[PDB]
């Protein structure tokens, strides 16, 4: 689990969005596994505006933050799960690292701020949904 809190926005994995989130929907993209909902209080996370390919992510299944190199956001085939059929996930970044389903929501960060959140995994690879292109999160 986990979310990004920036301004009056809450960014979560779409497959983990609650009743409050869909009701207060700002934007969602199934192909990206992202959902943004409005919030009453102001958030304090800064979104990174960069092309960094190295950062640190939180892995709840290990209670540890791991440094990783990750690929640039792209269209990656993701195996079927209980949340989605087999499909190409867009704006996805992969790294060699540990992840489990309950690790979704874990933040990936570089020196510039929040890069994205854990979204997929399997076979010693962890996939992160990029949020750096969502410029409107800043306004
Ligand atoms: C972090 O997720 C891990 C990690 C390791 N084994 C499994 C998983 C779960 C996983 O990959 N998926 C289930 C939840 C939605 C995912 C698609 C999102 O577009 C697919
Ligand atoms: Zn950066």
From Swiss-Prot:
Reaction equation(s) it catalyzes: Selective cleavage of Tyr-|-Gly bond in the picornavirus polyprotein
Residues where Zn(2+) 1 binds: 50, 52, 110, 112
Domain of life: Viruses
Catalytic center residues: 15 (for protease 2a activity), 33 (for protease 2a activity), 104 (for protease 2a activity)
SUBUNIT field: Homodimer.
Function description: Cysteine protease that cleaves viral polyprotein and specific host proteins. It is responsible for the autocatalytic cleavage between the P1 and P2 regions, which is the first cleavage occurring in the polyprotein. Also cleaves the host translation initiation factor EIF4G1, in order to shut down the capped cellular mRNA translation. Inhibits the host nucleus-cytoplasm protein and RNA trafficking by cleaving host members of the nuclear pores. Counteracts stress granule formation probably by antagonizing its assembly or promoting its dissassembly.
Protein name: Protease 2A
Annotated organism of origin: Coxsackievirus A16 (strain G-10)
Lineage: Viruses, Riboviria, Orthornavirae, Pisuviricota, Pisoniviricetes
């Amino acid at each position: 689990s986990g979310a990004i809190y920036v301004g009056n926005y809450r960014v979560v994995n779409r497959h983990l969005a609650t009743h409050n989130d869909w009701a207060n929907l700002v934007w969602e993209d199934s192909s990206r596994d992202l959902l943004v909902s409005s919030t009453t209080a102001q958030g304090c996370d800064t979104i990174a505006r960069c092309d960094c390919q190295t950062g640190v992510y939180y892995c709840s299944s290990r209670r540890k933050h791991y440094p990783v190199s990750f690929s640039k956001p792209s269209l990656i085939f993701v195996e079927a799960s209980e949340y989605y059929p087999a499909r190409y996930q867009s704006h996805l970044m992969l790294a060699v690292g540990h992840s489990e389903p309950g690790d979704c929501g874990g933040i990936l960060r570089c020196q510039h701020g929040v890069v994205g959140i854990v979204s997929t995994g399997g076979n010693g690879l962890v996939g992160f949904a990029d949020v750096r292109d969502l410029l409107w999160l800043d306004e």
